[PDB]
Structure formats: C-alpha cells, structure tokens
Amino acid sequence: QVSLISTSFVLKGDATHNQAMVHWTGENSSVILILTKYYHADMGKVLESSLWRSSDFGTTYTKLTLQPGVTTVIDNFYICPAKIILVSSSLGDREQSLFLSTDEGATFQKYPVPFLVETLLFHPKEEDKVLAYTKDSKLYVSSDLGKKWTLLQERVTKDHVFWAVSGVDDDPNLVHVEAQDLSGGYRYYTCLIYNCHIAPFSGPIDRGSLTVQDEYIFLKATSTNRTKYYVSYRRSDFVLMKLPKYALPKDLQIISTDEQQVFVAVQEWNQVDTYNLYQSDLRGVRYSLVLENVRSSRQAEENVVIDILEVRGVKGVFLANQKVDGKVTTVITYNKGRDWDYLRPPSTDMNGKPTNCQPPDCYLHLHLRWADNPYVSGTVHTKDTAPGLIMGAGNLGSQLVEYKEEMYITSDCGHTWRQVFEEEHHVLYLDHGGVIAAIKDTSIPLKILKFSVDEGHTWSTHNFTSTSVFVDGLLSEPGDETLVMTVFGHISFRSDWELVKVDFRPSFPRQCGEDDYSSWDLTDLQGDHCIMGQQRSYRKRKSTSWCVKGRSFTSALTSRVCKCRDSDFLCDYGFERSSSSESTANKCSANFWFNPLSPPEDCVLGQTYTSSLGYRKVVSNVCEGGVDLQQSPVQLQCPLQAPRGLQVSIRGEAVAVRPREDVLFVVRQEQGDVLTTKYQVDLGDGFKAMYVNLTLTGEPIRHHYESPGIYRVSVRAENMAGHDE
Amino acid sequence: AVLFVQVNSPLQALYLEVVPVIGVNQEVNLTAVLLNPNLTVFYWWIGHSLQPLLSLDNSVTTKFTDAGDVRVTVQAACGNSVLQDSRLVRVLDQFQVVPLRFSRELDTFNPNTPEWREDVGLVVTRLLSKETSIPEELLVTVVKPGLPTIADLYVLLPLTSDKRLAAVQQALNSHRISFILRGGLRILVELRD
Amino acid sequence: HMGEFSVCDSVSVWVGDKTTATDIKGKEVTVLAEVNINNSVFRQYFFETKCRASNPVESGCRGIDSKHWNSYCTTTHTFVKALTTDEKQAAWRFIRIDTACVCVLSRKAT
Amino acid sequence: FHMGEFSVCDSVSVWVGDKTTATDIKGKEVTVLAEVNINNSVFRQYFFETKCRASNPVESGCRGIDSKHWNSYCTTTHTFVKALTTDEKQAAWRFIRIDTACVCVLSRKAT
Ligand SMILES: *[C@@H]1O[C@H](CO)[C@@H](O[C@@H]2O[C@H](CO)[C@@H](O[C@@H]3O[C@H](CO)[C@@H](O)[C@H](O)[C@@H]3O)[C@H](O)[C@H]2NC(C)=O)[C@H](O)[C@H]1NC(C)=O
Ligand SMILES: *[C@@H]1O[C@H](CO)[C@@H](O)[C@H](O)[C@H]1NC(C)=O
Ligand SMILES: *[C@@H]1O[C@H](CO)[C@@H](O)[C@H](O)[C@H]1NC(C)=O
Ligand SMILES: *[C@@H]1O[C@H](CO)[C@@H](O)[C@H](O)[C@H]1NC(C)=O
C-alpha cells in the first residue's frame, strides 16, 4: 500500500531525566543536536547536562564528550541562522565560557567570556555577528562569532532588543535598543556594530518597544490620565495612531503587522475577557473596526494571548473566536476582515448519520490557540502550513466546550470541512502539505502513528516504536519540502529519552511534473470566485501519483481579474456600517465624535487637505478600478487654525521655589501653530510681556521672584480666529 | 517622643469637575477628581482673591453674587508632587432651563470622561439648532456625571423667548430628535418630566 | 512482540462525563458535572486506569511460571477528593478511582 | 483477601499530609500547599500514595517469573491528581503526579 522507514533510538546514557532541547542544523543537513539538561527547583536553578549529536537523520545519536567533568551546558544552545555555525553556553557560580563550532558541532572550540550571560541573538544574515543579553541586564556584541566581545548598552529591557531588517531599510548593521535612561526613564536607542545615539523620536515608555521585522515600528507612551501609541512606517517620523477618541483602550497587542497593513487588538471595556480587532492602512495610522469580540487570556505573567489565526497560504484569510455572553463561536473571513461568517459542518464521519449539525442553527467551531481542558498535555494548535489545508481540533454545534474535541480538516480553505479524528492530535506537515502526520495528544503513552498523503481523506496506521512512549514533540527537517519527520519523548517504564526518525521518501522519491496535479478553483462560502478582486485557482497533487511537490511549489497558476464591487470597500477611520448581515449593503456613516468636515492635523496655511467620505478599498485587493465606487471627492481646502489647549508649566519638578532663583516657564498649545499668534504673559509680579510663536521656540523663559509669597501667571493666546487663556 | 508620618508619594492626574453655566446666587458643587484616601491636600482658588481654601474633601460648595466669567482653580499636593487644573465658567441671569431625557441604551456605552460628555452635548446642541433655526451659541447642553445619562439645556436670550421654548419643545416631542451613537445604535432625546 | 511488556494489559482513559461513583464508605454517590470555585468553573476530570482482561493468556497473567503458580490480573484502587452529592447534601467527598492493573499469584499444588 | 499469597511486586501504601513538593503533568516541579480554602471552609490536602518496596523482590526480578524466557523488574506506577499547588508566580489547581501502585515489567530473552 505505502512505503516508508521508521527507526527508533534511545539516548544510551542511563542518567537521563528532566528536560531536553532538540534542534536541527540548517536545511537538508541530516544533522540534529540535542541538549539533555537536568534542572532543579526550590530556587536552585542549577543545571547538569550532556550533549548529543546525530549525523544520520536522527537514527544514531553519539554522546559528545569533553575531557573534564562534563560541562554544565545551560539552557539555550543555538545555531547560526541562514551558513552553519553553532554556539554553546556554560554557567558557573560566577565563571562563564563559550563553545563555538563551524562543522555542525563536530569540533567545539572553547573560548572565555568577560561578562555574565542570559541569552544571545545572532544577526539574520551576518554569520559572524551576534549580540548578548547579560544577566545583570546588559547588551554586548561581537562581529567575530563571539570569540571576543565589546559593550553596547548597560540598562536594556528584557527581550526588547532588535536587529534592523536585512531585506528592508537597506542597512543591516543597526541595533535597536529599549534601555533605561537616567533614573526611571525608558528610551529607544539605535546604535551600530562598533559603538553608539537617539536618531528617532524618544519619550517615556514602560517597557513596550515593539518592532516587527516588516516596515513598521511601534511605541507605547504612558501618560498622566490617557496613554498614547505611536507608529513609524519605513523608518519615518513617529505619528500617533488613530484610535476612536472615546472607545477608550485599556491594553492593546499587535496581532499582525504582516503583508500590507497593521492588525491590532484593543481591549476597550475591562471585561477581562474580550478584545476588538482593528485594521489600519498601509501607513498604519487610520484604524477602523473589523471584529467585535475575541477571547483573551494570560498564562505567562506579562504575556497575553488572543484567539486569532491568519492563514499565510492565501493573503487575506483570517479565522477568529468570538466570545458573546458565554458563547465562544468560530468565524472566518476571506475579505480580510470586511465580512465574517461561520464554518460549514461536514455532517460526515466514519458513520455520517445526519443527526449532526446543519447550516441553519449550529455550525463548526475550532479551538484555535486555547486548550481549556486539562488532560491534553501539549499546547493546542490549528495549523495552516499549506494553501487550502487547515487542520485542527474543535467542537460541532453552537459553541466550544472542554468535553469533546474532534480533529477536523479542510482542503479547500474553509469551504469544505471534514471530520477525521476523535480527541486532539499533534499534526505535522511535510512537502508543503504533501503528507500529514497525526499523533494523539494526551497524557497516556502510545505506540501508534497516523499519516495521510491525500490531505486527510485516507489515513494509515503505523507502529513507530515498541515500548509505549509519552509524546513530547514533533519536528521536521528544515525547509518543510522534505519528508523526514522526528518524534521525541520519554518512554513509560523508564525515564530515558527516545527519538524516532520517519522517512516517507521511499514512497515519494520522484519530482512532481506539471501534469501530476489536478485543478481546484478557489471559491468562498458563497461560491464566488472574485476573492480580493482576483479569481484564483490552485493545483492539488493527483491521488494516482507518488511525487514530491518540490523545493519550489507551483500555486495560484490560473489568475484572472475582476472589476471592483461594493464588497471590495470597507469603512474608513471613524465610519460604521448600518443594519445587519444579508440586508443593507456597505453604508458607512460617520459616527458622532468626529466629522469628516474637520481639518487634518497640522494643515499649515498653503496646503490643501482632502476630506474623506468614509470608505476605502480593501488593502491588497487587486480589482480593476476606474469605476465602481472609487469615491475620490476632489474636495480641496484648508482653514486657519484656532488657538486651543493653552497650558503653562514649569520645567521639571520644582515643587518648591526660592526667591531670586532661575525659574523656567514653558507654554504649549494643541491646535497647530499659526504663524501670527500673540502670547500675552503676566508673571504675577507686574511683569508684562507679549511674545510671538512661543511654541515655535520650545525653550523656557527665565524669571526670578523677589518677594516670598504666591503669584498668578496668566497667558493669553490670540489670533484672528479665537482666544484662549 | 511622637512622630506623625504620611505615605502617598505618586500623584498621576487631576481634573476639576464643574458645570459650565449656572445662574447667580446658586450653590455650585465643585468637585476635584484625583487619583486617594482621606489623606488629600486641596488648595481652592475660587475667584480673584489670592487666599486659597484648604480642603481634605473632593468637593466644595460656593456661590457667586456677580455674573460674567469666573476662573476656578484647584491644586492638589498630597505627597511631594503638585497638580493643578483650572476652568472658566459662565454666570448668567437671563436664561431658561429645560430638562432632557436620553435613551437608556446610551448608558451601557457611557464613560464619564468629561470630553465624551462635551462632545455629546455639542452634538445635541447642533441638532437642536438645525431643527429650530435658532442661534446655536445660545444653547448649552450639560449631560451631568451621573450613571443614568441625564441632560440639562440652558437657553439664553441675547417676549420671543416663550416661542423659542415652544420651538425646542416641538423639536423634541412632535419630532423625535435622533442621534447616531454607534453603528446600528440610534439614541433619541426628549423631555424629562 | 518485544520491547517492554506489562505483566497485565491495562486500559487508561480520562473521564469528564462522570455522573455516578462509589465513595470511600461504599455508598453510591453522584459526582457533579462542573464545580464552581472563586467564580471559576472546572470540569470534573478523573484519570481512570483499569484492566483490559483478567486472562491476557490462557494461564492468567502473561509471563508467569505456570508450572508452579496460578495467576490472575486485577484492577487497583485509589481515592480522589471530588465535589459530589448523595441525593441529600453536597460536599467534597473521596471517591474510588482505578489506577493500574496488577497480577496476583497463588501456589499451585504439583 | 482473595488476592493470594502476595502480589507479584512488593507494594506499600501511605496517606501523606506532609505534601510539600510534587511534579505536575507538564513536567515542572511545583510546591504543594498545606491547606486549601473553598468558600470559608478550610481543608487539608491528603494524598494516597502507593509505591514499591523494591525493584527485585527475588533474584529474577518480579516474584514468580519464568526467568528461562523472560527478564523482569518491578517499578512504581502513578496517576494524576488535581491538587492546589503554586509556583514562583500564581497558585492553581494543577494535576500533579502521585504514586499509586507497583507493577512488573517483562522483556523477552534470547534462547
Ligand atoms: C481620568 O480619566 C479617567 C478616564 O480615562 C476618568 O475615569 C473615570 O472617572 C469616572 C468619574 O469618576 C468614573 O465613573 C465613576 O464610577 C463610580 C463607580 O466606580 C461612580 O460611583 C461615580 O459616580 C462615577 O460615575 C469612571 O469609572 C472612571 N473610569 C473610566 C474608565 O471611565 C477619571 O475621572 C479622570 N480623572 C483624573 C483625576 O484624571
Ligand atoms: C501494532 O499496532 C497495531 C494497532 O494498535 C496492533 O494491532 C499490532 O499488534 C501492533 N504490533 C506490535 C508489534 O506492537
Ligand atoms: C453636592 O453633591 C452631594 C452629592 O450628591 C450632595 O450630597 C450635596 O447635597 C450637594 N450639595 C449641593 C449644594 O448641591
Ligand atoms: C474623611 O474625614 C472627614 C472629616 O471631615 C469625614 O467627614 C469623612 O467621612 C471621612 N471620610 C472617610 C472615607 O473616612
């Protein structure tokens, strides 16, 4: 029927327990490294370890030795990204060292460290460049693979240091840092590989610097009664992000700054349960509503999780779990968030008795990122590696529960779902969705293994081991175009570890030809082919063919275009939709707090702003424009600004003032700067003085009071538009 | 030996809550919203006189014998930090007061942020002016801080004021004055008996 | 075939759909489906593990010196504290839960 | 006492009120609370632990083994109990590993 090989191996060391790390080295190398480490609780944090290396698909592991008492390798041993180099870290009471390899861990050379260590981080492309986070919160760097070291920063924050993108920004030697300045200041620095200071905007943050490797940079400005959040696109000047003025945020998290725009989640009302999903434009400023409610938890102390999954196989496909009242429902969108809908039930299994759910009153639901129930040991997952393939565990009805989890799969990107397994199952993909392997996720050991080569329509069972094993993890050879699988866990009767190599290549040793595929046109839940303005059709491997989809995969070969429609436009910032689903079309009306007549921020006299009508084309929608609700109003104007938000303050924290002292005064506005603005000033002691463009200076003015006592300072901002005090 | 100590180091923000308009000889229930227990230091600058009033409580109650514009300032220094907020209010004499009912649904989306309340009152005033053709700056809407959303409208003069009152009454009752709060959510405003 | 055999064949399963059980005193009690503690709702999950069969082979347990011994497999027994009710009062009672399958012997008379 | 002479392996039971440390299902060592508060009622975490006395009750591992064809040894098995424990951060009703019985393991010999 099929043809494969399976080989088990036990780490020969009898003294094996506690934890372990398994990692491949580069693509198509057949070399695996493992660190078997022994932890200690009760504030000990001590480690004892051994090192293992396999140079043959993980079928034979050699215990790598060193001459003295075996080195206490600590936690992260890590490889060089992209270019094979290995680094191992070692802890002592106060002492430290390092080990470096250039031949896949065959010859580890020893080097010393002139500082402590907590973690490391390589450069995405530079092979010999790597920085080091030092336990006492420091940041060192090295361009010679860590043989020697120099110092960059001294008060960095935990896991808020980044490298500049190598593909973007055209400069690859930058180091972005979130570091504590002075006493209780947090700033954003940018240094280079040699030395340093603050090129972009910098203010106060409470540990919230976030830079996704795409074009965006973000900032969390904590303030006095209302907080702010800033964005920087293509390393431009920082701009306050446009959130609803009165739909107030408590906390927020960047869901996806992937592809063209920004997806953020913002918890408005403190239900401690739900978030709202907002979407921006290409610049990442104009945020509009997309999804109403989503689950939200907090496993780690300061880390939260939000139930949403973006299918990378098709740009613009999202799945999300909403929590309304007490019901957790699953919804999907192909319109990149414009319209969402439920998942279609299969109504078939081994016994497809149609007493199961029909469309009208109960659909299909999936546990995306949350496993409520205890017996499952591994983290829950719904995977989306291949285009059109989405496999995951869930319920089948009106909401999700903890009791019953069934493994469903879809091969046409949500349109057709099918039920496969009872209970949850670890899933591993091979050959860009060519082979799907499943292992029951539970606390009981097992010896079975499910696998399917036809996208979950026919599975086969295999005894991959002899003694029953606790399943800890599934890994694949890097690239995922291969067909080599690695299973690892500790067996039942004894505690020693066990790994299993699985090789499906004996059944797939041939390359797929262009005639080894069948057609599959992309539709949605409505049978419409114009998705994102583009009719797409993909290829699916023939059932009567045993071939490899290849190092490079051919997808979306049949591409046709459509003209734009009302379904290709959503509301702009501050506009909302009327009525309900399958009723009134996309009518975006302006809500009350803001009106599109208002001028934009910083319209200097001379410029001409363009008012908006409340609609915008779906970002990444490639429909034929020209006609079909382009809605270019051609409304050009700009008015003179009026003085508002006038506030006078004293520089710093001079809570008490002494007579004959350099007292510094600063005045600020909020509604632009008109180039003819009068600022009258009385300093309470008869000092009359009128100035112009005080906010243009930004620097204080000195004054010295003669008599001890109380005074009232009055400032008047005046134009030909209004007056403020 | 005795030593009294107090422990309230950080102060975040303050805000002075006061209605924008009230008549002469009326008691004003000024509130000083601050970050705090009964340990609170409050300096109150009610008017022109320098000498500030001392208070441990958030609220004070005062009057105004004169009309016009009054500067009301409040300063808070519980620990070693100084916060201060000011507000200018109008004291009138020629006006008519109208109570205003809002729809109940608005309550479920009503934060007491004074700027939200300001924008709501401004929207109500705009709609009143658009449905009565009367001057817009002579209509002041204050929607209160209470949990149930209740508004009060001040209608100024600078007779014909009876017909203006009747015009607003017809604008609210005979035609229901509508308000688009949230997408798919419409609020209505009418009279509060 | 090979590897490491268990002397008796066991069957493990998690049970969240628990309705009835037997308490420590021997009275049939009713296990509540869900528990409320600190406004958190838990499902009563119990890990049960019984025997697959009392005769894995012809001579009772597997791998016994049958020439001089008689053998048979039997289920184990432990107690778990769970929120139950006895048709009258709801309380946190201890209930009987299976955990393993063990072989027991008896000397054979040649 | 229809069991027989003895079990194939030497078992020993005990009730543990002195529960301080344990290992959860995820493999992390946690600290066990001494007492539990539910509503206003205070309980104590008692655990019923049954383990082995020895891995070789006789010379050929387990008691009553056809050692001419098998190798044997006794080992302690377990189950998971939902108990109120805590880590360095938060306390929760975690499932921890508790010994509950003693079993025998066999392996085929080479004739
Ligand atoms: C700072 O700004 C915040 C909003 O960001 C203001 O917080 C809100 O203040 C109102 C008025 O005090 C709170 O409503 C109150 O609720 C209590 C019940 O807890 C009720 O008894 C009162 O009658 C009043 O309605 C509201 O909960 C609070 N929070 C939010 C999210 O709106 C605050 O007033 C501002 N203050 C300062 C000093 O900056
Ligand atoms: C392999 O597993 C199958 C299904 O569980 C079972 O029928 C068969 O006996 C097993 N074989 C071995 C050698 O374990
Ligand atoms: C001020 O408000 C408080 C709170 O309702 C009330 O007890 C008091 O009577 C009010 N005083 C005046 C003069 O309105
Ligand atoms: C604070 O002290 C004042 C004394 O004037 C008293 O009236 C008030 O009830 C006290 N409030 C609290 C919360 O103790």
Author numbering:
A (entry chain A): 131 to 212, 216 to 329, 334 to 862
B (entry chain A): 863 to 897, 900 to 1022, 1032 to 1066
C (entry chain B): 129 to 238
D (entry chain C): 128 to 238
Which sentences from the paper describe this structure?
The crystal structure of NGF bound to sSorCS2 was determined at 3.9 Å resolution and shows a symmetric complex, defined by a crystallographic two-fold axis, with a 2:4 (sSorCS2:NGF) stoichiometry. An NGF homodimer is bound onto the top face of each β-propeller of the sSorCS2 homodimer. Both NGF dimer chains interact exclusively with the sSorCS2 β-propeller in a mixed hydrophobic-hydrophilic interface of 1920 Å2 buried surface area that is conserved both among SorCS2 and NGF orthologues and paralogues suggesting that this binding mode is common to SorCS members and proneurotrophins. NGF β-strands A and B of one monomer and C and D of the other monomer form the palm of the hand that has predominantly hydrophobic interactions with loops on the top face of β-propeller blades 8, 9 and 10 that are part of the tire. In short, in the sSorCS2–NGF complex two NGF dimers each interact with sSorCS2 at one side while the equivalent symmetric receptor binding site in each NGF dimer remains free and exposed.
The type I transmembrane receptor Sortilin-related CNS-expressed receptor 2 (SorCS2), together with SorCS1 and 3, Sortilin and SorLA constitute the Vacuolar Protein Sorting 10 protein (VPS10p) family that is central to many pathways in control of neuronal viability and function, and has been associated with cancer and neurodegenerative diseases such as Alzheimer’s1 and Huntington’s2. Two roles have been identified for VPS10p members; in particular, SorCS2 and Sortilin are well studied for their function as extracellular receptors for the cognate proneurotrophin ligands to regulate synaptic plasticity and trigger apoptotic signaling, and they are responsible for binding and sorting a diverse set of ligands for secretion, internalization and endosome to lysosome sorting. The cross-braced homodimer architecture and the domain composition of the VPS10p subunit followed by two PKD domains and a SoMP domain is predicted to be conserved among the three SorCS members.
